[PDB]
From a paper:
Na+,K+-ATPase is one of the most important members of the P-type ATPase family. Na+,K+-ATPase is the main active transport system responsible for maintaining electrochemical gradients of Na+ and K+ across the plasma membrane in all animal cells. Such gradients are essential for cells in, for instance, generating action potentials and regulating cell volume.
We then proceed to visualize the substitution process utilizing Tl+ or Rb+ in the medium by X-ray crystallography, as both Tl+ and Rb+ have larger atomic numbers than K+ and measurable anomalous scattering cross-sections. To visualize the substitution process, crystals of Na+,K+-ATPase in E2·MgF42−·2K+ were soaked in a buffer containing 100 mM thallium acetate or rubidium acetate and flash-frozen at various incubation times between 0.75 and 100 min. Diffraction data were collected at wavelengths corresponding to their respective absorption peaks so that both difference and anomalous electron density maps could be obtained. The time constants were determined based on 14 (Tl+) or 5 (Rb+) data sets selected according to resolution (<3.4 Å) and unit cell parameters. Presented in Fig. 3c are series of difference Fourier and anomalous maps around the transmembrane binding sites at different soaking times in the Tl+-containing buffer. However, at shorter incubation times, substitution of site II K+ is much more prominent than that at site I. Essentially, the same maps were obtained for substitution with Rb+. The electron density maps at various incubation times clearly show that the substitution does occur in the ATPase in the crystal lattice and is significantly faster for site II K+. We tried several ways to quantitate the occupancy of Tl+ (or Rb+) in each site, and found that anomalous occupancy as determined with CNS15 gave the most consistent results. The plots of anomalous occupancy against soaking time thus obtained are well fitted with single exponentials. They yield time constants of 41 s for substitution of site II K+ with Tl+ and 105 s for site I K+. Using X-ray crystallography, we have been able to visualize the sequential substitution of two K+ bound to Na+,K+-ATPase in the E2·Pi state, and thereby shown that the K+ at site II is the first to be substituted.
Residue numbers in the entry:
A (entry chain A): 32 to 1023
B (entry chain B): 25 to 160, 169 to 217, 223 to 305
C (entry chain G): 4 to 42
The structure:
Amino acid sequence: LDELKKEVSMDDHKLSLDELHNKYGTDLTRGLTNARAKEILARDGPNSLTPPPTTPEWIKFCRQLFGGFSILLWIGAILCFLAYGIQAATEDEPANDNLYLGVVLSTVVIVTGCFSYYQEAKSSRIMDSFKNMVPQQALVIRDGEKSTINAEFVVAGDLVEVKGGDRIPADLRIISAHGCKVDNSSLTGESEPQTRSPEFSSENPLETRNIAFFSTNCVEGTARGVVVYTGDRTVMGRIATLASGLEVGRTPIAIEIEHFIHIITGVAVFLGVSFFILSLILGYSWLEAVIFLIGIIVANVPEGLLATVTVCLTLTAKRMARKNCLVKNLEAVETLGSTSTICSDKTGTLTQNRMTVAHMWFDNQIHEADTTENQSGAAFDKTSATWSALSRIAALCNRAVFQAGQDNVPILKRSVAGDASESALLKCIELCCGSVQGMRDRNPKIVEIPFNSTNKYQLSIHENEKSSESRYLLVMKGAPERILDRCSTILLNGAEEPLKEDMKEAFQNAYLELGGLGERVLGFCHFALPEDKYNEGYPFDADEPNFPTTDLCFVGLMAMIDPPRAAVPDAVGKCRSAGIKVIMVTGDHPITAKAIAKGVGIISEGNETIEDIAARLNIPIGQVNPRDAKACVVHGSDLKDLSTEVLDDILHYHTEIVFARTSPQQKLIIVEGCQRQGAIVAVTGDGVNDSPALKKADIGVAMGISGSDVSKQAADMILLDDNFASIVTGVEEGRLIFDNLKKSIAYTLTSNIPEITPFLVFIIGNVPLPLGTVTILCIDLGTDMVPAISLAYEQAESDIMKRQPRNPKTDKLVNERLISMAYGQIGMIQALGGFFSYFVILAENGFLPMDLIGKRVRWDDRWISDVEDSFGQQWTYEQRKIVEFTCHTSFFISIVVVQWADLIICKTRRNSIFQQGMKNKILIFGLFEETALAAFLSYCPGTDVALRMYPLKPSWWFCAFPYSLIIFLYDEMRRFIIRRSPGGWVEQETYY
Amino acid sequence: FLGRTGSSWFKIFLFYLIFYGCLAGIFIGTIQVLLLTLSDFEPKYQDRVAPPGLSHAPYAIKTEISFSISNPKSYESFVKSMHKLMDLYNESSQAGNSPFEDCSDTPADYIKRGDLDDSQGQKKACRFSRMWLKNCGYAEGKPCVVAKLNRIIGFYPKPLKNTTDLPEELQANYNQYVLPLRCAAREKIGSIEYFGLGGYAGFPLQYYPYYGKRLQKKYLQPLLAIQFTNLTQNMELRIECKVYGENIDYSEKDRFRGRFEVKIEVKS
Amino acid sequence: EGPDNDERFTYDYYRLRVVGLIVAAVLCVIGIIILLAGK
Ligand SMILES: *[C@@H]1O[C@H](CO)[C@@H](O[C@@H]2O[C@H](CO)[C@@H](O)[C@H](O)[C@H]2NC(C)=O)[C@H](O)[C@H]1NC(C)=O
Ligand SMILES: CC(C)CCC[C@@H](C)[C@H]1CC[C@H]2[C@@H]3CC=C4C[C@@H](O)CC[C@]4(C)[C@H]3CC[C@]12C
Ligand SMILES: *[C@@H]1O[C@H](CO)[C@@H](O)[C@H](O)[C@H]1NC(C)=O
Ligand SMILES: [K+]
Ligand SMILES: [K+]
Ligand SMILES: [K+]
Ligand SMILES: [Mg+2]
């Protein structure tokens, strides 16, 4: 469906103005007829974007109500009402058991539904942001007259007019223009104004001057044009549809959840029906056969687990909110940890998005300035008298000014009225020479010649601030070579000197080096005009050369670039140390893209492209073995004629990849290419041209300050302070939460065994029921909750940023090793500790373990109010039941006591508690509150009716203590083996 | 295979065999020590049987014994359980001076055979003739229910003293030696008739305290036969038999805590 | 005692409940203290 939109567009900028009118039945001068425009409206439809059909929240909520655990809990809830119905008909049961348990279980499903619904959130308003880029109104020429109309009423063929400050209402063929410049950052991510004129200037319509696009704005001048595309058919309207239309897809974390749901659901249905038939064979009435099944359901399903996961995710997202990293989708909290490839935009993401002075060439020396936002570098020069001469030209031969009321904000961050290069120079001098306004007050400008297309230079004449002179100084800047052809002397370390071929060659060298760094280079020179030839009232003519512009003194060079953000180089290296592959994907030109790649460490030192090898060896590129080149730089124009299989080979064959001059669909294609190889991919960006890629990414991260509204709609995560170091933190947090989820899951599952085994022995042994159904829910929904959550606050056991990204195909959240430990080893020890306390309670009340076998028949018989114990005493029905429920209560408390040790062992997968310590305060809180809850549930009056919880005698609490301790020792010995031999036996069997 | 290789499948079996073996051996060990802390003659706790329960022979479907006099197999179900109990009170079961003793044919005081020790043989229990149960196949019309006080080791059932008012106000009040049992329904549409030891409507105190199964096997607890020769027919009659005493109490939950709940209906 | 051994069939479930609830409360307070050591 969207495969059409993933392709490069076709256009009609090649046609003549006249020819273009024939195609759209239009007038170049009079414009369309009121009738013809209305006709075309009904024909083509409105100049608007329609949002894609969404899934209502209704269906979204209910889709969770049927996912493995909820299905089993539904079967339980209904099976409760089943047994209740069968009762209400047969023998009038005045009880509330099956009825209430059926109500409780149905509530558990609904509430669990809210948790998973909260986790599976999708806040997407892509198409809405795009719609915000179409103006409310447009100016059209109809019947030879200009009028403002609803922009939706704009059709292909009419004559539109735009001017500085307004949004392009539709894709236009420029037919007339006067000084028109446009901001195409929507399509390129670059905000430098692009001229628009009627002349065709490139085969590529996205590069030609005679096309203006919807989603962009006119920055200055005026233009008229013929509408060629409207609504969904515009270049960026299609990007809108592509972006808004892209199928979301399941996250890595989501896939893991479903996976263990299958496992646990599997064992649940297995043991469920495996013992349902095992009971009927033993001659159990279907009346009972279902009651046992309900218990089996409740025992096997970890009722509180899915909600635990959600809370652990939420708590991890809260910590990241506190580092200026907003998470829109709870699952995106983990994806960053599983990320193996980052596709990053350059401008406004890796870079500050601001022309900044990078180097200066004066005194036959290359000086480097500090490009960082917060200025974390050092000085270059202050002493040289040459510097002050260059500094003066940079301030004086400059027409840029700071906007009013910025004195509060830092120099480099403040808004400037002017072109990017003049702003850069302004901020450079203001920083290291103080107020520039002061320099422009001490040296009043009397005449100037602003930068001309033809002159290729800008000159200014000022009253020298010096009192002993107060004469006229000439300054000029422009193209380095043009400035050179106008110089005779060079200000070396203070004093001038003739411009010999020697210094002239050093100039060329300096010029070539700076240009090689992808930096824009300017020349600077001045000339102190002779006093006798220029009186204090001498008039200077700016129109006609009234003053010399030759034999001037060359002062120096200055170079500039849109520099990396301070934290970016280090963040890139850190991603790469964690084994994450970092690719650059930018709408910017290749020379600039490549230079920043080396600056931030995308391309490491020494690595070459095929073009680099060819130039170094002075040989044809076809003569170069492409396998000798680990780095590559792909232009979008070449990308366009490559198949995906060939794109896949590029991705496979290079470690250091730069995709430059890419369109928005091309970014999507590169992302998909990476994913196709089985990689989890993150995208980082800030422009509307990142929207499709951000949507398709497993996780999209947008910049918060510099980011466009669209990009932040398309993302899963926002960096609110533009701190790229947050990606590094995000991946670290993502890995940590993945491990801690394992700990929390194992902990929760472990207590399933002591809830399952009592029901089994109840059938096979014919003893009184050791633990009840209600009692199970008091564990999974009550006591285990805070402890399970607390594992989310566990510190790393080792340097997680030192390991490679997990293999999502092999490294699962819940594997066989977890089940073996939780179900086969620790849970089994917990089961016994439960049974022990059960036998203790009964034996101390007169029913010794031996006489318990095959007694349930008489025990449950409501009409036998005289059962004989081991000592020959006789018990009524309600009397023995009180002891039985007291058994449920102590078995319950036994679970809590054995979960103490389990909580401590689940703390660490490898390390010892004596190494990791007990610095998790939430965990300790869990221990205290868990025990408080259990005690309250046993001793609070009335709980014997609502939950069948009975007061325990002090000695009862200590039954499971020896089992709780064996768990601690056992797991500590086991992990001691793991560490002592990384070989594999204990490791490959039990290492979560 | 599914998971691993044969070598791995073996090792995982050798482990869980030794592992579960140890766990079973430990579990058994903790059961040993538990038993080691307990007496053979007396349970550690008795507060959960404390107030004695009162149970009868007619096995009630739901605290009810409804049947038809004009039908044979209508009551043959209740006669099965009635027989089961009384079959134990046979004279052939109580033979010789061992381990039985002839006790007062009239309600007497308690009898202490020492302590809950094995320092003596089987503590000798009082004989009880089912022949003390006058009038009661059993009552084919108007049932002859048999009551019973639940056995509790070392329990001395203490009758109420005639200090103040009483339900069966002072009638045949053998204050010193009889634990009374008065059945009731207002709703007085019946005819209560009690049979027991010495002809009294109670339990003779000479059968106490019970020394337990280990120290007193073949022991016999006193019975109290109750006959309802009601002149009514074809209606559910809620009859409650209540025992009175200092150590006797009741509960709204446990409807068998020192009392009966019988729903007789001679639907004939 | 002899016939006056009523205490054998008695248990102070009332005190046990009072003590049990005291303990539960204090464990609840202790937990808050440790948690609130930083929020
Ligand atoms: C306990 O006493 C009952 C009294 O009914 C015995 O029942 C006797 O059963 C035999 C054989 O079935 C009959 O011939 C008699 O008529 C019954 N009564 C009597 C008085 O002998 C019963 O057998 C006795 N049980 C034991 C174990 O001795
Ligand atoms: C109540 C009692 C009788 C039930 C005992 C169940 C035992 C036999 C179960 C419980 C957990 C189970 C193990 C759980 C995990 C694994 C790892 C997997 O890669 C192979 C199977 C294996 C090794 C299972 C084998 C059987 C097992 C040990
Ligand atoms: C009980 O049986 C005796 C004979 O043993 C008889 O005289 C008497 O009438 C019976 N009593 C009743 C109330 O039927
Ligand atoms: K469970
Ligand atoms: K995404
Ligand atoms: K559980
Ligand atoms: Mg950008």
